[PDB]
Every structure is written in structure tokens, then in C-alpha cells.
Amino acid sequence: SIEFVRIDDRLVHGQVVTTWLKKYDIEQVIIVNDRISEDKTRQSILKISAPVGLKIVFFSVKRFVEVLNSVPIKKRTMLIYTNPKDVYDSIEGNLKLEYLNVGQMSEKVTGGVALGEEDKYYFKKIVDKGTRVEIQMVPNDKVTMLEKFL
Numbered sequence: 001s002i003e004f005v006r007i008d009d010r011l012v013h014g015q016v017v018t019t020w021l022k023k024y025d026i027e028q029v030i031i032v033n034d035r036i037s038e039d040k041t042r043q044s045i046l047k048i049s050a051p052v053g054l055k056i057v058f059f060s061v062k063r064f065v066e067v068l069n070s071v072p073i074k075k076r077t078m079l080i081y082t083n084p085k086d087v088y089d090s091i092e093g094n095l096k097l098e099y100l101n102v103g104q105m106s107e108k109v110t111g112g113v114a115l116g117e118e119d120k121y122y123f124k125k126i127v128d129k130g131t132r133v134e135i136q137m138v139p140n141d142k143v144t145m146l147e148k149f150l
Contacts, residue, residue: 005079008103028055028075065093084122109149
């Protein structure tokens with residue numbers, strides 16, 4: 001029951017994410033990131049910043065792939081990544097991804113997304129695997145298809 005997967009440098013920072021948690025009626029955010037999965041300090045800050053009723057879990061890519069293949073996911077879940085490489089590695093780990101939302105990436109391509117060489121490489125692999133990829137900060141924001149810049 002992964003409802004929504006998003007690439008966002010802010011993660012759970014601000015009013016940006018909560019629009020998405022309302023829209024998809026999210027009960028659970030999984031932040032899938034190696035560094036954050038390592039770092040209790042940034043986990044504590046993100047837990048401190050999360051809205052009232054939200055369960056937040058942190059996984060490395062490896063561990064998340066393992067869980068994905070070993071555990072059914074009941075709660076309505078939003079996955080947040082910070083880069084397309086971890087998304088593609090999750091796809092090879094059997095994440096079925098028809099639609100991928102890109103929030104903020106901090107070179108410049110559009111207002112909110114700054115792409116490197118690695119980013120363009122993996123984004124191209126994602127769009128190649130069939131995934132529909134949309135830059136959109138907020139549900140009311142204008143959609144731009146990322147393939148545009150690939």
C-alpha cells in the first residue's frame with residue numbers, strides 16, 4: 001500500500017509535505033536514505049518536525065528493499081527519497097513504480113530541481129523502465145515532465 005513516492009530534499013520539512021499527506025491520506029512516511037538511516041541526529045530533527053499523527057520510519061535502501069520483499073505494508077505509506085539513484089535501486093529491488101513525483105532537488109533545470117550527471121543518468125533509467133516522472137512541488141502546483149530535460 002505504497003500510495004505515493006517522492007524525491008524531496010526538504011523531506012518532512014515544512015507545509016510542503018503535509019499537502020501531500022492530506023491528499024493521499026498518508027498514515028506513514030518511510031524516508032528511504034542511507035545517510036539518514038545512519039544518522040540519529042537528523043532522524044531526531046525530522047521526528048521533531050513531523051506532524052501530529054504521522055508514523056515516520058527510516059530505512060537504508062538495502063533494508064527497505066528487504067522489508068518490501070519480506071513484509072506486507074498495511075498503513076497508507078508515503079516514501080520519501082533524496083535522489084533518483086536510490087529510487088532506481090529500489091526498482092531493481094522490485095518496487096513497482098508507475099508514477100514518481102519529484103519535489104525539491106538542491107545544474108539548474110527547473111524551479112526546484114537541480115540535476116547532476118548521476119541524477120540525469122538514473123532519472124533516465126527510471127523513465128526508461130516505464131515510470132512516469134513529474135516535477136511538482138505542491139498538489140496545486142504546475143506539473144512539468146522531467147523527461148523534458150533528459
